[PDB]
Short mmCIF file of C-alpha atoms and ligand atoms in Angstrom, two decimals:
data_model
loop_
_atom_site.label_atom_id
_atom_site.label_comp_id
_atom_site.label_asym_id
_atom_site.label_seq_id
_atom_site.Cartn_x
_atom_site.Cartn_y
_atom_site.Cartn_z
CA UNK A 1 -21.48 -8.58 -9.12
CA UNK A 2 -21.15 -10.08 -5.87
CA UNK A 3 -18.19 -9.52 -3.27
CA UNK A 4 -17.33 -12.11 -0.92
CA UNK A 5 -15.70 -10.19 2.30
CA UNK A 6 -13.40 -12.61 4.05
CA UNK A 7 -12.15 -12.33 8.05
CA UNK A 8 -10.00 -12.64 9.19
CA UNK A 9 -7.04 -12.51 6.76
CA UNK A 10 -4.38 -13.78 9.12
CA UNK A 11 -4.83 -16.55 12.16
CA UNK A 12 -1.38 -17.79 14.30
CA UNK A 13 -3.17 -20.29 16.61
CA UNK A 14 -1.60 -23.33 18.49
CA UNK A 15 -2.18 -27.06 17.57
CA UNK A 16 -5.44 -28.52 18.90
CA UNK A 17 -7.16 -24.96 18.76
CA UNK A 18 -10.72 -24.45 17.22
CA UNK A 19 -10.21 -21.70 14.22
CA UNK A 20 -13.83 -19.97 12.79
CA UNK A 21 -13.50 -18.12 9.11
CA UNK A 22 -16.13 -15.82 8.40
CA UNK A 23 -17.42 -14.95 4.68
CA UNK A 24 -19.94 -12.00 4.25
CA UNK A 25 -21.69 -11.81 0.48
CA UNK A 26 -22.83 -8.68 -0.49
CA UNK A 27 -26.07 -10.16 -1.45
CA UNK A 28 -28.27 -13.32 -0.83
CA UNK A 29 -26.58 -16.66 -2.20
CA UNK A 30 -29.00 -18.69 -0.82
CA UNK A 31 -26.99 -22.02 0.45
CA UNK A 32 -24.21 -22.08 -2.81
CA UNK A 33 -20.94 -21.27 -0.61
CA UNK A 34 -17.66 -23.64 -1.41
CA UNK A 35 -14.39 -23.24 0.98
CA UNK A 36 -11.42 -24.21 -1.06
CA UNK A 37 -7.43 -24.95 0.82
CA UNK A 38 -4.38 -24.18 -0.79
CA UNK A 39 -1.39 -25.56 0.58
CA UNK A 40 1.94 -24.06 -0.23
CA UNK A 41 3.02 -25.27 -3.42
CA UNK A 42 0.12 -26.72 -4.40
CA UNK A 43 -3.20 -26.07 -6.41
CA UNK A 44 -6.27 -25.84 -4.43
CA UNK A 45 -8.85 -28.19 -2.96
CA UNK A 46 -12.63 -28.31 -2.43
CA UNK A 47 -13.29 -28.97 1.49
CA UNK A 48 -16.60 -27.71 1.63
CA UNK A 49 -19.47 -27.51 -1.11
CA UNK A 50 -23.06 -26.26 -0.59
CA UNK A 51 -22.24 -24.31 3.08
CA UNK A 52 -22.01 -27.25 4.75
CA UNK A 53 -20.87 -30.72 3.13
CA UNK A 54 -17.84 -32.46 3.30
CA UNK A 55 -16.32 -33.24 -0.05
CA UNK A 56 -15.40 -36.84 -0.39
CA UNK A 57 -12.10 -37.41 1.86
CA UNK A 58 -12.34 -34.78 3.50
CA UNK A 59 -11.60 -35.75 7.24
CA UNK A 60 -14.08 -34.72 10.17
CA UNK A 61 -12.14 -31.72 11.86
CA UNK A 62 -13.77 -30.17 8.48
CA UNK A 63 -17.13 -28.17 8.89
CA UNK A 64 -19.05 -25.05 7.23
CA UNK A 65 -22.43 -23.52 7.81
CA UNK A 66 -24.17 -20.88 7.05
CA UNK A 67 -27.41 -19.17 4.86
CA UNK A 68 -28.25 -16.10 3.03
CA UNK A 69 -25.62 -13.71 3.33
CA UNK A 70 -23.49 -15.09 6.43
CA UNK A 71 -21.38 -18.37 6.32
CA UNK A 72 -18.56 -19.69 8.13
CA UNK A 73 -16.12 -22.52 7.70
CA UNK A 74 -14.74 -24.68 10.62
CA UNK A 75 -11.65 -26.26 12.02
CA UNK A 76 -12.80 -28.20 15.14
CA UNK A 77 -8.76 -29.14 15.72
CA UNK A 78 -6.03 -27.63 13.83
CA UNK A 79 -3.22 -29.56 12.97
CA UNK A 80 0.16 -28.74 11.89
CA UNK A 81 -0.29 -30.08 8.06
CA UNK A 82 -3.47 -27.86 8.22
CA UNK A 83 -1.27 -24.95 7.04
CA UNK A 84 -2.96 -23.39 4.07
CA UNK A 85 -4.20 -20.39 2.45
CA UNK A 86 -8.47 -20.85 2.88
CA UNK A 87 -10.59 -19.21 0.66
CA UNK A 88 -14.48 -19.62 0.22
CA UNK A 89 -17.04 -19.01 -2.91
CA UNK A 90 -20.07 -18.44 -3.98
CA UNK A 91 -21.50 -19.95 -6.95
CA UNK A 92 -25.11 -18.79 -6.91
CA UNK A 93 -24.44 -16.73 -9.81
CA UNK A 94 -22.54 -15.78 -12.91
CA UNK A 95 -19.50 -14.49 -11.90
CA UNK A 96 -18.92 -17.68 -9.44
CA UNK A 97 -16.70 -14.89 -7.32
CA UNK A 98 -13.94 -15.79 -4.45
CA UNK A 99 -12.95 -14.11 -0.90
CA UNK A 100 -9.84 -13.14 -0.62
CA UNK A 101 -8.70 -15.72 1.59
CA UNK A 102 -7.44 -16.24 5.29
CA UNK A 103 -3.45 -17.15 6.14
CA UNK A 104 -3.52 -19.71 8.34
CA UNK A 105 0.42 -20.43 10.54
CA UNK A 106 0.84 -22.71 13.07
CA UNK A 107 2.70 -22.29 17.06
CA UNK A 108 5.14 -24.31 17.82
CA UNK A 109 8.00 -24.06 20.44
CA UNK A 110 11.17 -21.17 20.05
CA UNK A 111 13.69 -22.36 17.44
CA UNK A 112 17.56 -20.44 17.10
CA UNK A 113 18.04 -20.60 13.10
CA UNK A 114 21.15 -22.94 11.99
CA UNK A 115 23.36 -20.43 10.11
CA UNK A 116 25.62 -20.88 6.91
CA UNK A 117 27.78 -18.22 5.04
CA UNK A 118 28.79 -18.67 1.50
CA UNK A 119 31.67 -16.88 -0.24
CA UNK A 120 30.53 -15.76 -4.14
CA UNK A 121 31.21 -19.03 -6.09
CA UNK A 122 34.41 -20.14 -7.93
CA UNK A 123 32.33 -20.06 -11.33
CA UNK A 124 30.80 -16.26 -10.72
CA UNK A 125 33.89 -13.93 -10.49
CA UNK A 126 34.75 -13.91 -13.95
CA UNK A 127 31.48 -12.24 -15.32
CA UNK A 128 32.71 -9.67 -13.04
CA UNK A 129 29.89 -9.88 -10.00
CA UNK A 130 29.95 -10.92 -6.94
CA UNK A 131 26.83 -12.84 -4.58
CA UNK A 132 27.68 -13.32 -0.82
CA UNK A 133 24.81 -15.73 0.00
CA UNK A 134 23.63 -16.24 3.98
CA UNK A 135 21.19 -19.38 4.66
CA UNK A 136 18.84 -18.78 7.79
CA UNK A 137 17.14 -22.45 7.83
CA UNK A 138 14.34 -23.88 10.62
CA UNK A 139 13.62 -20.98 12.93
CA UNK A 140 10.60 -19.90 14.97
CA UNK A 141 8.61 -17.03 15.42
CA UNK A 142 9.32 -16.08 11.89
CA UNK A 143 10.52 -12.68 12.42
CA UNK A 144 14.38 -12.20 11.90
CA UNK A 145 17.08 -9.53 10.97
CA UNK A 146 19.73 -10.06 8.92
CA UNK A 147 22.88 -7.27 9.17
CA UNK A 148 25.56 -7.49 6.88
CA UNK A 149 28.95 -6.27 7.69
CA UNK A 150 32.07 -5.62 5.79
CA UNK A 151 35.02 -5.08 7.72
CA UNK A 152 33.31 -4.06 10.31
CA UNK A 153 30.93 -1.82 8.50
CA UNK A 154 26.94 -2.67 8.11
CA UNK A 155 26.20 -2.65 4.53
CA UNK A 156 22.82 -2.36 3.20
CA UNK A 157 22.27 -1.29 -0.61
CA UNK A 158 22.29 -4.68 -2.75
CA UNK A 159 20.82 -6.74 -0.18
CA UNK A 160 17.95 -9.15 -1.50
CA UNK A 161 16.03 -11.06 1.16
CA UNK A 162 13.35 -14.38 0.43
CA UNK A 163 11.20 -16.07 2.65
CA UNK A 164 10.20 -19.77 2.58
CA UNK A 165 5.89 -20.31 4.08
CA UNK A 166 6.05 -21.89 7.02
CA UNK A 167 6.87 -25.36 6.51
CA UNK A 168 4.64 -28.44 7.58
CA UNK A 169 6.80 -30.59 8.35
CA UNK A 170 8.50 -28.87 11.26
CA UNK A 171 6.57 -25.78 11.75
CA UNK A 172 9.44 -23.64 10.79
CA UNK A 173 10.37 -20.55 8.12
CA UNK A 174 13.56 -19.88 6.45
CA UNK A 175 15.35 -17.25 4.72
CA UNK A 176 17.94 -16.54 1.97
CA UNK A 177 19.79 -13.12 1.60
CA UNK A 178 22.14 -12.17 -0.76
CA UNK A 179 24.79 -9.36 -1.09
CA UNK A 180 25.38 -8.30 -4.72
CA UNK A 181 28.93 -6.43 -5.14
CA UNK A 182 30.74 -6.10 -8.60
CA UNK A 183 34.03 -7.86 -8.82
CA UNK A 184 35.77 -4.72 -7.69
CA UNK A 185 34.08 -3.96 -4.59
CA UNK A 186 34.39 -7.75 -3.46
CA UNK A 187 38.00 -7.40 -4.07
CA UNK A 188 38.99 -4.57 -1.89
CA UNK A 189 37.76 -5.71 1.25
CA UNK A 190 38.53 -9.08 3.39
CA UNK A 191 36.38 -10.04 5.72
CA UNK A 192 32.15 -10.78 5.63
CA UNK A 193 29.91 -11.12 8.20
CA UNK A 194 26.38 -12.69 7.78
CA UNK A 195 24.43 -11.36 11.18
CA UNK A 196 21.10 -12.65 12.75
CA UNK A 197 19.63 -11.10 15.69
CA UNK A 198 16.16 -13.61 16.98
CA UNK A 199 14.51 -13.57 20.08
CA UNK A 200 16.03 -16.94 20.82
CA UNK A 201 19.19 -15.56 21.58
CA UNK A 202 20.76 -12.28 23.60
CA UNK A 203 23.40 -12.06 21.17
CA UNK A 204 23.66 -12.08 17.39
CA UNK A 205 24.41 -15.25 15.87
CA UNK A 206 27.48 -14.76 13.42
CA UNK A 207 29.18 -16.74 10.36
CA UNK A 208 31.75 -14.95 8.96
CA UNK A 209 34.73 -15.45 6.66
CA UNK A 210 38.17 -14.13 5.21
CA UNK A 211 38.34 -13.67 1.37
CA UNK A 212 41.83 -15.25 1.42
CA UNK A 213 42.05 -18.05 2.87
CA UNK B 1 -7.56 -40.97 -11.98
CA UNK B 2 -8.24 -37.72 -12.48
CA UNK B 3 -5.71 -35.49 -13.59
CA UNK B 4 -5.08 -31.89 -15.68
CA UNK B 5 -2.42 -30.37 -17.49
CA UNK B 6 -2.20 -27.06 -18.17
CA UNK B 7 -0.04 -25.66 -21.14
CA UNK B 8 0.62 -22.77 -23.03
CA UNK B 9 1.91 -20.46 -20.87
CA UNK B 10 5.25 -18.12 -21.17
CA UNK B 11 5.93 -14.74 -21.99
CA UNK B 12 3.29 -12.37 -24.00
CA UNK B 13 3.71 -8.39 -25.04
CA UNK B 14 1.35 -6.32 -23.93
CA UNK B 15 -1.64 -5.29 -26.33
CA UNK B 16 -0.65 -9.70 -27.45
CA UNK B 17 -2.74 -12.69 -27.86
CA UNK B 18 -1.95 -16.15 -26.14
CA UNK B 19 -3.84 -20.06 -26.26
CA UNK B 20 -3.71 -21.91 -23.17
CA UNK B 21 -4.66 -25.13 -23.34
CA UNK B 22 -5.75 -28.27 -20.98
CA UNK B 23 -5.42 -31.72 -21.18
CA UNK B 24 -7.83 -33.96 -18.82
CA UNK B 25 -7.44 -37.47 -18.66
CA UNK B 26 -9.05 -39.94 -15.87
CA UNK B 27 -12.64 -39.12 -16.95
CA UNK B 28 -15.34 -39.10 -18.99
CA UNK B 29 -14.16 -34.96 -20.08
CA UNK B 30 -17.58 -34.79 -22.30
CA UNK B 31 -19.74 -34.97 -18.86
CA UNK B 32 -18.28 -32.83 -16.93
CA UNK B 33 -18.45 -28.70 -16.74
CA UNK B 34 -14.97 -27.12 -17.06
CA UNK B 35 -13.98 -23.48 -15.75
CA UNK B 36 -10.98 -21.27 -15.91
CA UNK B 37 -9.62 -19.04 -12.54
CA UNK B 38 -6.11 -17.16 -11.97
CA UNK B 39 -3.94 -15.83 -9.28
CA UNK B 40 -1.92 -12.86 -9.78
CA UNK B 41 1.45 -12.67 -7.84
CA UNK B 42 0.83 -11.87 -4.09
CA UNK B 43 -3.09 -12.06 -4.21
CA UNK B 44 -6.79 -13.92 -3.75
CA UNK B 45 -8.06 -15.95 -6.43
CA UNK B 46 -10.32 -14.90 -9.35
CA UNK B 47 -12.80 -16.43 -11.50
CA UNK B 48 -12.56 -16.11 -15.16
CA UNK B 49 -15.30 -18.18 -16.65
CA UNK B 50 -16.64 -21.68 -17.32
CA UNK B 51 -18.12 -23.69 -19.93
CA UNK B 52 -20.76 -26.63 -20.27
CA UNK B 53 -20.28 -29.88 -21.92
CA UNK B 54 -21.89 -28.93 -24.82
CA UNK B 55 -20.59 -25.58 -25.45
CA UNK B 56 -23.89 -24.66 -25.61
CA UNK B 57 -23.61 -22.52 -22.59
CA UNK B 58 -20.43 -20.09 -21.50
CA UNK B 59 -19.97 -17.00 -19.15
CA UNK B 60 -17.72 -14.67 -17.85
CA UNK B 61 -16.16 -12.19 -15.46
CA UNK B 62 -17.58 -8.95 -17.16
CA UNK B 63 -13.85 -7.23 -17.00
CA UNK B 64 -12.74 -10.38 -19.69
CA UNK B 65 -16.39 -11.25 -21.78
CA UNK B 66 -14.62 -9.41 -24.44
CA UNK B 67 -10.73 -9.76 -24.64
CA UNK B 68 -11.19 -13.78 -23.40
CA UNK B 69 -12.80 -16.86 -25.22
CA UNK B 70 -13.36 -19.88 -23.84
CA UNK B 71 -13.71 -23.03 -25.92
CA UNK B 72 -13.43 -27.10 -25.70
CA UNK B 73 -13.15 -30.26 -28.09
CA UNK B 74 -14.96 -33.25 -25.79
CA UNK B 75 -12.90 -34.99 -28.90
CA UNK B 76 -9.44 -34.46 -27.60
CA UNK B 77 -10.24 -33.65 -24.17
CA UNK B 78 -9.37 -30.46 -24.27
CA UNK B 79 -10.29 -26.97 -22.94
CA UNK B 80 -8.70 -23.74 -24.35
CA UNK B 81 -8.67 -20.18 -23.10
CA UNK B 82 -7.59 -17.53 -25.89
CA UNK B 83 -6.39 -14.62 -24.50
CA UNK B 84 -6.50 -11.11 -26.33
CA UNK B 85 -5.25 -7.49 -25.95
CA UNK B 86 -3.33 -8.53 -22.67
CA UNK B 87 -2.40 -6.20 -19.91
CA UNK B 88 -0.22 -6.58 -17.00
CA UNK B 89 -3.26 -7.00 -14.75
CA UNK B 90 -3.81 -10.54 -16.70
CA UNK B 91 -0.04 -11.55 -15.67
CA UNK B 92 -0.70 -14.43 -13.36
CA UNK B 93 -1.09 -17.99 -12.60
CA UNK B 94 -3.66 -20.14 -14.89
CA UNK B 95 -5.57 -22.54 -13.62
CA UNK B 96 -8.02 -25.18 -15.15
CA UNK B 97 -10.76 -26.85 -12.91
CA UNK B 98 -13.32 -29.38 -13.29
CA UNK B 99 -16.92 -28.64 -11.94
CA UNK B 100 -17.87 -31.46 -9.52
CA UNK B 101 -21.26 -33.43 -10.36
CA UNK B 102 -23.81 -31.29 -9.90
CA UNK B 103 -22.32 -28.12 -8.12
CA UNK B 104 -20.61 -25.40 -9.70
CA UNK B 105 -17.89 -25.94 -7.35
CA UNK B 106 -14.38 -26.46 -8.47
CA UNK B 107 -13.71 -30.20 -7.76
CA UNK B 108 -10.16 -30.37 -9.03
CA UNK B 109 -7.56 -28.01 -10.05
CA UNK B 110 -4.74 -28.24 -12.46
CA UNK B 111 -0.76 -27.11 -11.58
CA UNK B 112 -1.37 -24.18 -13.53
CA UNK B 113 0.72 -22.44 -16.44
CA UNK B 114 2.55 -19.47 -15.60
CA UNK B 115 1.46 -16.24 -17.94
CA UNK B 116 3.98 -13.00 -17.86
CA UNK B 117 2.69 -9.66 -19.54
CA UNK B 118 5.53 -7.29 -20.64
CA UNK B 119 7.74 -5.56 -23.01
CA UNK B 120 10.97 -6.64 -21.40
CA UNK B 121 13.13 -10.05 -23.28
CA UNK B 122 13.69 -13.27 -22.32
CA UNK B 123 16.91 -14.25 -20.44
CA UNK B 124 18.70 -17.47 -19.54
CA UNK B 125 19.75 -17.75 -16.15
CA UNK B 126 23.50 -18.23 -14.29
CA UNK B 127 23.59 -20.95 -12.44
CA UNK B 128 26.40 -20.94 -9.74
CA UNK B 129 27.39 -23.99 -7.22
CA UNK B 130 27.44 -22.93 -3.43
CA UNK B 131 30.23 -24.74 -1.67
CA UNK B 132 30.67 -24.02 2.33
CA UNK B 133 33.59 -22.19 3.84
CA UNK B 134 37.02 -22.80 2.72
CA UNK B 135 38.48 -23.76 6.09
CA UNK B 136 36.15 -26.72 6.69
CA UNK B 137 35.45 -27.99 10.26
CA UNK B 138 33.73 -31.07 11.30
CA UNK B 139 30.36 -30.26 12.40
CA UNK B 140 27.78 -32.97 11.85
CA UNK B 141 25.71 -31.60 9.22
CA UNK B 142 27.19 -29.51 6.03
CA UNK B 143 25.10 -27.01 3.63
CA UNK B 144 25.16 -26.93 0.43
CA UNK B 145 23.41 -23.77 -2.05
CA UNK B 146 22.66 -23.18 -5.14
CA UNK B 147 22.13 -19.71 -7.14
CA UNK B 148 19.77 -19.09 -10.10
CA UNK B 149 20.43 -15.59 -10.76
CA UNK B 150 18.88 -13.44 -13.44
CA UNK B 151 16.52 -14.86 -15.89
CA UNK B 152 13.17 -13.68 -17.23
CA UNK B 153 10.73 -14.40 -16.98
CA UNK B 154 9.39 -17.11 -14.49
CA UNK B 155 9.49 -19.76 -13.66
CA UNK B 156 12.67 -21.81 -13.13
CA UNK B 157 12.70 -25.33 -11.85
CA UNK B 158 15.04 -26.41 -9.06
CA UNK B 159 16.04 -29.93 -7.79
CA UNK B 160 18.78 -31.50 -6.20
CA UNK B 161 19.93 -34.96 -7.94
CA UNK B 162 17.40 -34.82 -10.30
CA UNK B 163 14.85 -34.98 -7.42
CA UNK B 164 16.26 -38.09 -5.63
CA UNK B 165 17.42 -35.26 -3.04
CA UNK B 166 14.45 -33.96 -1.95
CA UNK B 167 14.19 -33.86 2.32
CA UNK B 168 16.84 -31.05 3.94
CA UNK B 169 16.05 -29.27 0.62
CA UNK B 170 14.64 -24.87 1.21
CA UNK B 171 14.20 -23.37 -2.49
CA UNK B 172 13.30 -19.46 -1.85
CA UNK B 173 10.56 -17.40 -3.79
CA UNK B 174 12.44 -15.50 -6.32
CA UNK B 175 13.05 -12.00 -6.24
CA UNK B 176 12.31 -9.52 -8.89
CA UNK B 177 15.49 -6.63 -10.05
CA UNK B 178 15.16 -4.61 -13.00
CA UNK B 179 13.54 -7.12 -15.48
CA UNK B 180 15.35 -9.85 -13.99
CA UNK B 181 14.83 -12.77 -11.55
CA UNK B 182 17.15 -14.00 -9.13
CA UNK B 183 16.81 -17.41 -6.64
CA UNK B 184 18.55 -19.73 -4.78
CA UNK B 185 18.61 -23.16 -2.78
CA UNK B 186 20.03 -24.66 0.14
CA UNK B 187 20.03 -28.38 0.31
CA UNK B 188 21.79 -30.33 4.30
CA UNK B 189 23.16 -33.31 3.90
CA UNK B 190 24.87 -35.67 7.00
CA UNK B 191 28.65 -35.08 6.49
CA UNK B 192 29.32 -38.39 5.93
CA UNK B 193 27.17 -37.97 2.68
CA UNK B 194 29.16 -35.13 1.20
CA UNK B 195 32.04 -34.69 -0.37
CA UNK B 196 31.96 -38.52 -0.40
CA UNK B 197 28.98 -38.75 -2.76
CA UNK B 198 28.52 -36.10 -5.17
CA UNK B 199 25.67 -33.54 -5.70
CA UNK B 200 24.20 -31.46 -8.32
CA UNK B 201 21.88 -29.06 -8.49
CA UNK B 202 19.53 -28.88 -11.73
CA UNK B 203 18.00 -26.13 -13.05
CA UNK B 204 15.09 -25.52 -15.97
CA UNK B 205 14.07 -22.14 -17.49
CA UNK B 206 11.62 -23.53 -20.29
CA UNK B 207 10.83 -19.87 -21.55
CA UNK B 208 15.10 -20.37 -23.11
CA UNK B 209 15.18 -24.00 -23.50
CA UNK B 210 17.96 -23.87 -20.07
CA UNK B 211 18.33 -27.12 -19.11
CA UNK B 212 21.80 -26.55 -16.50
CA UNK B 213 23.71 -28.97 -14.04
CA UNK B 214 26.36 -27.79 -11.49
CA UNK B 215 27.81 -30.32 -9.55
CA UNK B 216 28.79 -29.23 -5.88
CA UNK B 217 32.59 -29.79 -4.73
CA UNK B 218 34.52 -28.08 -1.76
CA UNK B 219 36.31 -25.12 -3.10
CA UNK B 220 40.28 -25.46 -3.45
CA UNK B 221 42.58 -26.68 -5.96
CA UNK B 222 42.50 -28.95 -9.17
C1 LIG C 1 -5.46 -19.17 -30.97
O1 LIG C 1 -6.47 -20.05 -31.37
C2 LIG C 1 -7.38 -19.49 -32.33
C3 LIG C 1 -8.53 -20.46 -32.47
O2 LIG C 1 -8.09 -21.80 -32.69
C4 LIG C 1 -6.62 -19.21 -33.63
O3 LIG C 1 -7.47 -18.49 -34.51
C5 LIG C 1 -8.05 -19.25 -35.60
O4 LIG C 1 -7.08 -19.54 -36.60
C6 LIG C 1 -7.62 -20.17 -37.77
C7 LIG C 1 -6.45 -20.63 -38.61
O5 LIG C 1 -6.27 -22.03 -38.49
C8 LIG C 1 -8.52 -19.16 -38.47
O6 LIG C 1 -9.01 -19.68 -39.70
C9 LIG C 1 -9.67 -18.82 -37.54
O7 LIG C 1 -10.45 -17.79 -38.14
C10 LIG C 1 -9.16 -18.32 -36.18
N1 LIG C 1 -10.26 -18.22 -35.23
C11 LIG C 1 -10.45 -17.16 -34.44
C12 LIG C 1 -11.64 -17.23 -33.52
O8 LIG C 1 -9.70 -16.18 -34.47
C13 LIG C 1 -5.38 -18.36 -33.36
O9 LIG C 1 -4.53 -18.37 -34.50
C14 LIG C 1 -4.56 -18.84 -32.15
N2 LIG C 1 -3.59 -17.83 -31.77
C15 LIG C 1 -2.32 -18.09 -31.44
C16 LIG C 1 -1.49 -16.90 -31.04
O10 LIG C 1 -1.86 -19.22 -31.48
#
């Protein structure tokens, strides 16, 4: 059974670069490579069939080549809505096996993240739980610490954190974290600070709030 | 104009059997080669097997030739994948793909249908409005959220206005917790949009038949 070995996994390259993914097969596959993009969100597409042929609509900045057991696929000028998983095949053979694919993120310039805070909702109290939820929307580089802090004090058990891909339309990455308390534990305590520290900025950014008020 | 629909999918126990079907429409679906593939959470891509327009010829990955059969009717445009004594190495993503003309390259991909392996029970989500702070100031933009929390298993669907709300919109990967599934959305609005003109979030989880509206007001009395 034939492995496809994929390089490199991850690429963070600037708009208007030249990008070059590699695919090594563990055995000959003669010229019966395909390169496949899947966007975030979305299912994939065929870019590149038989090493090195565009796929109808696929645009120009769109190349492969290669034989035997080396093949490559080509970006001549990356563009932001180029952002996509890339993953190539061979189908010489029964199984018709994929690489494991290459992450591709875009540069763009710094970006501070726009911060909201949200007190648990009027509808959640009852059931006797309680979700402090933080939004940290449109911000670049993508890495980013959250702290949370109850009067005063960082707390960190019950602390879920998600990640949005980086989005095409703006270049940017947000995040969602989420303080789970019971009822009780909200209740004996005022004050609740959502805290993000980003290279943008010297200083934490913080949105914070008063349980009565 | 091309087009698949994969179906099917939900929840399965372990050691189960499942039919996934896949309905083609925009071509002639008694030409064409048809395949199977899947992607697990977090990882590549992986073939699972294909099948002529005649039926006459059908292959596999050798780690499903004998738990997975793959099958068609050209009468009802159709391919199916029966699924047998099902791990939770086969929970994934299932897609269906059409072989373009002449290469056994997949030319076009379904959405998909979503297939969980386990022992653990289906669950409706919450579904709880996000309003901002109480002591609103004037800034020019406002935030809005809105929290599935857990259900089981995935997926949920998420819009805002029943998709007429779609730009300023972030929905998060969900985030697994003991057998349960939590996720949220943020949707930013102009001020002068909201509280003025309403807005609801709407949320599906078909694995409960959940169909659930909150509509988004500023917190304080009624
Ligand atoms: C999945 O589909 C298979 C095939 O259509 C079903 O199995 C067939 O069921 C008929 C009853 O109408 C039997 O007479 C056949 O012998 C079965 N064929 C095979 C190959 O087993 C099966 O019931 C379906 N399973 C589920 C869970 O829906």
């Amino acid at each position: 059974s034939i492995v496809m070995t994929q390089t490199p996994k991850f690429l963070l390259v600037s708009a208007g670069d030249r990008i070059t993914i590699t695919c090594k097969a563990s055995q000959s596959v003669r010229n019966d490579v395909a390169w496949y993009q899947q966007k975030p969100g979305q299912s994939p597409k065929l870019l590149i069939y038989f090493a090195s042929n565009r796929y109808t609509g696929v645009p120009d900045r769109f190349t492969g080549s290669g034989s035997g057991t080396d093949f490559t696929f080509t970006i001549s000028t990356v563009q932001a809505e180029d952002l996509a998983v890339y993953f190539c095949q061979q189908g010489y053979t029964s199984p018709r096996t994929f690489g494991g694919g290459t992450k591709l993120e875009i540069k763009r310039a710094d970006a501070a993240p726009t911060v909201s805070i949200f007190p648990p909702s009027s509808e959640q109290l009852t059931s006797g739980g309680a979700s402090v939820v933080c939004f940290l929307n449109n911000f670049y580089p993508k890495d980013i610490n959250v702290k949370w802090k109850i009067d005063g004090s960082e707390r960190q058990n019950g602390v879920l954190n998600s990640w949005t891909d980086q989005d095409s339309k703006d270049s940017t990455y947000s995040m969602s974290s989420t303080l789970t308390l019971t009822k009780d534990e909200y209740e004996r305590h005022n004050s609740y600070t959502c805290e993000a520290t980003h290279k943008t900025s010297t200083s934490p950014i913080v949105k914070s709030f008063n349980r009565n008020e | 104009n091309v087009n698949l629909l994969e179906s099917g999918g939900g929840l399965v126990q372990p050691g189960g059997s499942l039919n996934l079907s896949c309905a083609a429409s925009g071509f002639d679906f008694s030409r064409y080669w048809m395949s199977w593939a899947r992607q697990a959470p977090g990882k590549g891509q992986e073939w699972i097997g294909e099948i002529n327009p005649g039926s006459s010829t059908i292959k596999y990955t050798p780690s499903l030739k004998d738990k997975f059969i793959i099958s068609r009717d050209n009468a009802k445009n159709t391919l199916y994948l029966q699924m047998s004594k099902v791990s939770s190495e086969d929970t994934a993503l299932y897609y269906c793909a059409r072989y373009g003309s002449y290469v056994y390259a997949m030319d076009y991909w379904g959405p998909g249908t979503s297939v969980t392996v386990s022992s653990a029970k289906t669950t409706a989500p919450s579904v709880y409005p996000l309003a901002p702070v109480c002591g609103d100031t004037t800034g020019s933009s406002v935030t809005l959220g809105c929290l599935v929390k857990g259900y089981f298993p995935e997926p949920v669907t998420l819009t805002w206005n029943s998709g007429s709300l779609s730009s300023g919109v972030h929905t998060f990967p969900a985030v697994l917790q003991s057998d349960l599934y939590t996720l949220s959305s943020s949707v930013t609005v102009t001020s002068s949009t909201w509280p003025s003109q309403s807005i609801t979030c709407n949320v599906a989880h078909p694995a409960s038949s959940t169909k659930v509206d909150k509509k988004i007001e500023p917190r304080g009395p009624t």
